[PDB]
Design a protein around this nucleic acid. Structure first.
Ligand SMILES: Nc1nc2c(ncn2[C@@H]2O[C@H](COP(=O)(O)OP(=O)(O)NP(=O)(O)O)[C@@H](O)[C@H]2O)c(=O)[nH]1
Ligand SMILES: Nc1nc2c(ncn2[C@@H]2O[C@H](COP(=O)(O)OP(=O)(O)NP(=O)(O)O)[C@@H](O)[C@H]2O)c(=O)[nH]1
Ligand SMILES: [Mg+2]
Ligand SMILES: [Mg+2]
Ligand SMILES: [Mg+2]
Ligand SMILES: [Mg+2]
Ligand SMILES: [Mg+2]
Lengths: 450, 62, 102, 198, 18, 95
RNA sequence: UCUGUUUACCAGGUCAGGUCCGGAAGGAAGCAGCCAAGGCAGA
């Protein structure tokens, strides 16, 4: 949670006019102690913050002379170029065959990441995927891959602990070339970088498969040893890329920076939940912005994921509002669809303009509130949903009693639907550019918060 | 302040005052763009200016 | 020359809280003080979405006239009245009964 | 650690994803069976793919009964019934697994709390032990892990794993300084004999 | 598409602070 | 001119649809300036402080509206607006 | 004696969603949708 420390830091800087180099210094020190609190590659903390120090001395901006915009912009863009220079769109280069391996320390997230890639590339590539587990060591690891593969709808190549990993992956590659697959995901056992028999074993594995891609998997909570791990794995194995996992934790995962300092290999993907859908393309703009608290890249990516899962359902709510007008039917459809894409952190990060006025500790529980709405509007007869104005006291007693909640809550939800009804009408009558530009941010006077 | 400023020559005061004006300009430029969180800053600088000026005078006056 | 100050432990002479003791949060200009656990009122708050303020009945602490609170002597366990003397060159407060400094 | 005198003595295992909970449970199971204790296992990870099977395989290897349920079932349930089968077989120690969860998710922390409440409702005195598993490659983020985990389930102990690696696991110092939570064991490999006393 | 962004953006959003 | 005067001229960026329109289409920015400043001094002050090239500065004076607060009739203060033409050359942006 | 149709909570059954108890095992009150049904108009 750098944003607590980095917020006091870079926000402190963004206050003071024509800042002395001393609070510049102190702020750098707090970024250092902040990344030190994040257990990111402590020597690489020192290096990074020395770089930020040298960069932050002589900048001038006519737009706004504020040095805090300079520290925020510098820390951002510098973490950006050090983390691979805005590589989101690029990802991995696809050839008609592709063979990718997942390697790294015990428990970093390799098996999970393999299935995430499977799902993601299954969606984007429109092609066929085969996966295989080279892990004969961890109990039930193969079964884990089989389960994940069955869940993501990806062909699974069987293997058991009684075999040799080389023979297994050789068989897998053979079957794959025979059955005309393209993307191949090979999940390997977790291993210490200082374990020679294992590292040799998978040097042999790589030698047998001849992969186009070797991906090192990093827990974002990985410590100072990262630079030592990445190098080791890059010296024997050598890796062509990096995946950074568990970024949904408060760990800042700048260890990958060390990993990208030694290796020089791009970081392709951000693991952002425990679910298969949780593979994101990595992007330094997104991780650095995510740290800083306000983001333009993650705003366009969460509005484009919301718009992708909600396209046919907002066109279903727009067709029913074209025929019967806006009802609790079109609203309820909006509710279930809205509950399926639901998350709060990907929503507040999309809007920096509203988060500048309100506390960043603001959270509505979407899983709670949304499903509550679905439930309450599941307690209405179809006439009350298509004709909401007839909902009365006894009706709200009935609705409140049906879902096992309070009448006040139902009042609140019908209030919400009232506001969204109005908004639907205002959107209907006015031109899109006028209705979007005429929205007012009200202060009861320019004096703030009152 | 004002003991601190008192021990500086007229020139360094004249470099200080211009600095303060640049800072002031920048600050109200921020406040005008609605990007300003701490408002306590305007008053800080707006008053410091006066301090400086009030010295320049007495260094010329006597 | 102000007798009752922040963080003094006081005892309440008058009102529904008569006899209760507590700690001073702050003072107000009008001669009113606000004391810990003292003079709770039940206030109704219209829920405010900007401050993420829920609604409901908030028990809050309402200002009490400073004439009504006495500085609590911990030595004697009694309410006291206060006076001023000069010790060192500094102006200091003391209890009238045992004439000991604070 | 003293596991003596309870029917059973129940130990809850907590920690974030991938730290070594399920393997550690295996190791402890061995360690205490070596001391003549009768031990059984709760697979309290009913969430992650093969999270129960993995422990069941460990218990199969160690001849230690593992209570098990379906994927999608309740973890706390398997833990309770595990305490019950534990009592039924007249054993000293049950070791309750839990699904990995990031400490800052904070609903899952509440899931752990629920588990605790469960073990409380079977045996009024249990669990007497809550142990947090920390990875050695981890660090000052595991400070915060110790914070939300201790704030949640009231940890009585800590086991640091993967100390056979190059990582010194120094973050312990900052944790133990803060919460005064005693370090119990250090995991030094992936086999059953790889547990050591701190 | 547009109407998606329009609707759901200030739907989710406008629901949170208002 | 003296620089000390300059830094006192330009109050604030003027934000509105007309403003945005000219800024995009004709390459022109819109300023609230001190009531007494002149085209000379505004040309000078932009060219100096934003360090970009001014072509010409057109101005007008806005009479403040008349308002009522609690029956009382007040008068919002006057002020001066300046349309400031930059040559196609420079590209002025809000970061 | 059959057809359409309607009839929010306050006849009945199923009772999704959600919600109470429990750790679970599982029960449970029951909104909505469906079916009788209350009818009636037409026969
Ligand atoms: N919250 C969260 N959990 C993740 C993420 N990626 C993986 N995990 C989780 O972390 C744990 C370890 O993942 P797993 O795939 O077994 O890692 P592994 O590297 O294959 N382990 P091993 O080295 O034993 O083979 C699993 O609980 C899993 O669900 C992520 O991006 N976010
Ligand atoms: N080298 C080494 N590896 C260990 C040690 N302890 C556990 N591991 C390993 O780390 C990986 C994850 O272990 P596991 O027991 O599945 O961890 P978990 O915390 O139960 N994972 P989840 O949160 O997904 O349930 C396994 O490969 C395992 O062999 C250790 O002391 N040393
Ligand atoms: Mg694995
Ligand atoms: Mg486990
Ligand atoms: Mg002209
Ligand atoms: Mg004119
Ligand atoms: Mg006036």
């Amino acid at each position: 949670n750098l944003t607590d420390r980095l917020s006091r830091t870079l926000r402190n800087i963004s206050g003071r006019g024509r800042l002395t180099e001393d609070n510049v210094k102190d702020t750098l020190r707090e970024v250092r102690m902040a990344l030190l609190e994040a257990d990111v590659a402590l020597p690489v903390v020192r290096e990074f913050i020395n770089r930020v120090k040298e960069k932050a001395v002589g900048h001038e901006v006519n737009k706004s002379l504020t040095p805090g915009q300079e520290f925020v912009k510098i820390v951002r863009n510098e973490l950006v170029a050090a983390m691979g220079e805005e590589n989101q769109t690029l990802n991995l280069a696809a050839q008609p065959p592709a063979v990718v391996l997942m390697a790294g320390l015990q428990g970093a997230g390799k098996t999970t990441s393999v299935g995430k890639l499977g799902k993601f590339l299954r969606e984007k590539h429109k092609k066929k995927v085969l996966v295989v587990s080279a892990d004969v060591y961890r109990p039930a690891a193969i079964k884990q891959l089989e389960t994940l593969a069955e869940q993501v709808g990806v062909d699974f190549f069987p293997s058991d602990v009684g075999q040799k990993p080389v023979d297994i992956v050789n068989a897998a590659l053979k079957e794959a070339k025979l059955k005309f697959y393209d993307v191949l995901l090979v999940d390997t056992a977790g291993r210490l970088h200082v374990d020679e028999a294992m590292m040799d074993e998978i040097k042999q594995v790589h030698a047998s498969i001849n992969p186009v891609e070797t991906l090192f998997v990093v827990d974002a909570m990985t410590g100072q040893d990262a630079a030592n791990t990445a190098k080791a794995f890059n010296e024997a194995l050598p890796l062509t890329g990096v995946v950074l996992t568990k970024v949904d934790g408060d760990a800042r995962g700048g260890a990958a920076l060390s990993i990208r300092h030694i290796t020089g290999k791009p970081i392709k993907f951000l693991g952002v939940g425990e679910k298969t859908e949780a593979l994101e393309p990595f992007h330094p703009d997104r991780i650095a912005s995510r740290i800083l608290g306000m983001x333009x890249x993650x705003x366009x990516x969460x509005x484009x994921x919301x718009x992708x899962x909600x396209x046919x359902x907002x066109x279903x709510x727009x067709x029913x509002x074209x025929x019967x007008g806006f009802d609790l039917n079109d609203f309820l459809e909006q509710l279930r669809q809205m509950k399926n894409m639901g998350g709060x952190x990907x929503x507040x990060x999309x809007x920096x303009x509203x988060x500048x006025x309100x506390x960043x500790x603001x959270x509505x529980x979407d899983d709670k509130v949304l499903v509550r709405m679905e439930a309450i509007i599941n307690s209405m007869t179809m006439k009350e949903r298509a004709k909401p104005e007839i909902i009365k006291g006894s009706r709200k007693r009935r609705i409140a009693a049906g879902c096992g909640m309070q009448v006040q809550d139902v009042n609140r939800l019908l209030k919400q639907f009232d506001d969204m009804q109005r908004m639907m009408k205002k959107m209907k009558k006015g031109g899109x550019x006028x209705x979007x530009x005429x929205x007012x941010x009200x202060x009861x006077x320019x004096x703030x918060x009152x | 302040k004002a003991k601190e400023l008192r021990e500086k020559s007229v020139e360094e005061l004249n470099t200080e005052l211009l600095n303060l004006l640049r800072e002031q300009f920048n600050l109200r430029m921020q406040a005008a763009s609605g990007q300003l969180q701490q408002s306590h800053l305007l008053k800080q600088v707006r008053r410091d200016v006066a301090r400086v000026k009030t010295l320049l005078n007495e260094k010329a006056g006597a | 020359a102000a007798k009752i100050r922040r963080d003094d432990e006081v005892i309440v002479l008058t009102g529904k809280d008569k006899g209760k003791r507590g700690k001073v949060k702050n003072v107000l200009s009008s001669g009113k003080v606000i004391v810990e656990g003292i003079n709770l009122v039940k206030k109704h708050q219209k829920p405010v979405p900007a401050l993420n303020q829920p609604g409901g009945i908030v028990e809050k602490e309402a200002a009490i006239q400073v004439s009504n609170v006495a500085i609590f002597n911990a030595a004697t366990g009694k309410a006291d009245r206060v006076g001023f003397r000069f010790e060192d060159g500094k102006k200091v407060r003391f209890f009238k009964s045992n004439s000991e400094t604070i | 650690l003293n596991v003596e005198g309870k029917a059973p003595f129940v130990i809850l295992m907590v920690g974030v994803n991938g730290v070594g909970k399920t393997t550690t449970i295996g190791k402890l199971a061995r360690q205490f069976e070596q001391q003549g204790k009768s031990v059984m296992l709760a697979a309290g990870d009913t969430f992650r793919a093969a999270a129960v099977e993995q422990l069941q395989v460990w218990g199969q290897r160690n001849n230690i009964p593992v209570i098990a349920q379906h994927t999608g079932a309740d973890s706390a349930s398997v833990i309770f019934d595990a305490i019950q089968a534990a009592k039924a077989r007249n054993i000293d120690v049950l070791i309750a697994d839990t699904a990995g969860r990031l400490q800052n998710k904070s609903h899952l922390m509440e899931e752990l709390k629920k588990i605790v409440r469960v073990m409380k409702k079977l045996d009024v005195e249990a669990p007497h032990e809550v142990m947090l598993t920390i990875d050695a490659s981890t660090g000052q983020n595991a400070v915060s892990q110790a914070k939300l985990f201790h704030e949640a389930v009231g940890l009585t102990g800590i086991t640091l794993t993967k100390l056979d690696g190059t990582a010194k696991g120094g973050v312990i110092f900052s944790v133990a300084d803060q919460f005064g939570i005693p370090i119990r064991y250090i995991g030094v490999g992936e086999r059953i004999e790889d547990l050591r006393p701190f | 598409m547009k109407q998606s962004t329009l609707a759901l953006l200030l739907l989710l959003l406008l629901l949170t602070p208002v | 001119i003296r620089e000390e005067r300059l830094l006192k001229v330009l109050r604030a960026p003027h934000v509105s649809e007309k403003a945005s329109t000219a800024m995009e289409k004709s390459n022109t920015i819109v300023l609230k300036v001190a009531k007494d400043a002149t085209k000379a001094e505004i040309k000078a002050a932009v060219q100096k402080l934003f360090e970009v090239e001014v072509e010409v500065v057109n101005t007008l004076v806005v009479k403040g509206k008349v308002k009522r607060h609690g029956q009382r009739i007040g008068r919002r203060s006057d002020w001066k607006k300046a349309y400031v033409t930059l040559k196609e050359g420079q590209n002025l942006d809000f970061v």
